[PDB]
Amino acid sequence: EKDFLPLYFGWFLTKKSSETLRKAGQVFLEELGNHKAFKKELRHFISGDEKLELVSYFGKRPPGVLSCTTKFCDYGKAAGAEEYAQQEVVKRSYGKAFKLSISALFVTPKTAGAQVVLTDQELQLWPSDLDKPSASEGLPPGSRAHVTLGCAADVQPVQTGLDLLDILQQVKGGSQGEAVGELPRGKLYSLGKGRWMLSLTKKMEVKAIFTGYYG
């Protein structure tokens, strides 16, 4: 027989970079929740019902260290998972160190995350797979790349990547609007339908190892 694969592949940030980014994500959620322009849009954010504390709202958080997922394999059950694992480049890079560039932080009524911009070599570790779900269109590859920081209670694993994909798809169409504020890290935007994106002024470099997760 052949040996079974991980739940997923990806970069797994260092203790430091996880701690460094996790705290940075949590400062953002308070700055946002405590922002007037934000408090103006709770009607589009939730359904019913006062000021909301986003850090408890996104109550489902990463147990330990943060990670950027490349290919979710589900132990071989997922499509293209098989071809993706035998790629030479995936085998070349398994165990190698990497640095990732976080260009922005976002929030929607479902997820909080951090956009990841992959380099050209890192993009080679991105699955150029056949069966793109509606969102992938239009955006350069690797755009889906992110790190999950939080999810609302009843939200499913895939949504974080889709939330970012929907947002970028809108910036694509030029519906960003103008920056409605200058958060301490950078520029803020309201995209409607309870969507937001902060474009960091100095992009955050985190160090990580490309490996697989089983658990």
Ligand SMILES: NC(=O)c1ccc[n+]([C@@H]2O[C@H](COP(=O)([O-])OP(=O)(O)OC[C@H]3O[C@@H](n4cnc5c(N)ncnc54)[C@H](OP(=O)(O)O)[C@@H]3O)[C@@H](O)[C@H]2O)c1
């Ligand atoms: N013994 C245990 O059971 C144990 C112990 C410790 C921790 N855990 C946690 O339990 C989790 C198990 O995974 P899960 O049930 O949360 O999600 P999952 O479906 O098992 O997938 C795991 C990861 O893959 C990504 N993913 C999930 N669905 C996807 C899809 N349709 N397309 C692309 N990527 C997808 C997500 O990463 P992104 O959101 O980053 O894209 C997610 O964090 C692990 O993440 C681990 O942290 C479990």
